Amino acid sequence: QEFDCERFRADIRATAAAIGAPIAHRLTDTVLEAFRDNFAQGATLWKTTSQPGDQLSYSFFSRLKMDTVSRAIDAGLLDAAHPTLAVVDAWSSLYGGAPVQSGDFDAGRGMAKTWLYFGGLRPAEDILTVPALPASVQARLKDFLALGLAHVRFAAVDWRHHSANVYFRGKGPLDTVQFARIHALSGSTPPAAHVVEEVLAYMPEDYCVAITLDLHSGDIERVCFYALKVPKNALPRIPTRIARFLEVAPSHDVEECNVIGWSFGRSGDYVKAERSYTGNMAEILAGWNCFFHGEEGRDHDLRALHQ
Ligand SMILES: *[C@@](O)(Cc1ccc(O)cc1)C(=O)O
């Protein structure tokens, strides 16, 4: 029911083996020792994608507010000279230090991402014109504003790939054309109509889309559309690897929480999935004002900012 650390170690080993993902035993023990409290007090959850052999990820969504980046550096999980540290510092220090850091880790490779919840609907300009970002990335602000992607709720630094994932909420409903315009940012081949129609059927009215930017070129590598807390009997068509993941990864939460993401990019499309483990993922998502599958997905503050 509750978070226990020895059980977590075993569930990491077991789940990685179940989906055919790599394992790094000592590195995983270091993450757990460095961030025990973070996992225990937050929502701890699982992630992977439909790419064959992909990593099993485990994360904490934070209730405890602290400098998780400094902790990761302390523990030898992140290089003290990582060139993206400046950006994560800039983002953490906005709005007088209100943003809260969470963390993603890979069972095979250690620290993967630092994720910031900014504590409201933030102007995209604030996020995208901190001086720590290069000109080439700041220049994409206008592409985003042109598509009406004007408010940001989260941003993640991907330490492994030197890129950033920016999470926007758009005023919808999302239609074929707006899908196409967002998808076109990614450079990848337009998909067939049933792909689009299925994605649209899972979106709330005011939709969540993640855009992945390379922090050195400003290239948009990837876009991802998300459906949160989809019940098992309402799931869209999924890759057998994702179906297996949702079956084998253990969830102890009172309310089960599965997340489905459709990722499109030039290197290949895939499906992302998240699944609750402990510490009440749904209750943290509700706190962030996320919209769940089969609900009212209307954002009134967003709608007042657009009128
Ligand atoms: C988006 O769907 C982003 C998102 C994705 C996964 C989790 O777990 C939380 C949020 C949104 O709701 O803002």
Swiss-Prot record:
Reactions that this protein is recorded to catalyse: 3-(4-hydroxyphenyl)pyruvate + dimethylallyl diphosphate = 3-dimethylallyl-4-hydroxyphenylpyruvate + diphosphate
Phenotype upon gene inactivation: Cells lacking this gene produce antibiotic compounds (vanillobiocin, isovanillobiocin and declovanillobiocin) with a methoxy instead of the dimethylallyl group at the position 3 of the 4-hydroxybenzoic acid moiety of clorobiocin.
SUPFAM superfamilies linked: Prenyltransferase-like
EC number: 2.5.1.111
Entry GO MF terms: prenyltransferase activity; transferase activity, transferring alkyl or aryl (other than methyl) groups
Domain of life: Bacteria
Protein name, per record: 4-hydroxyphenylpyruvate 3-dimethylallyltransferase
Source organism of this protein record: Streptomyces roseochromogenus subsp. oscitans
The organism's taxonomic lineage, starting at the top: Bacteria, Bacillati, Actinomycetota, Actinomycetes, Kitasatosporales
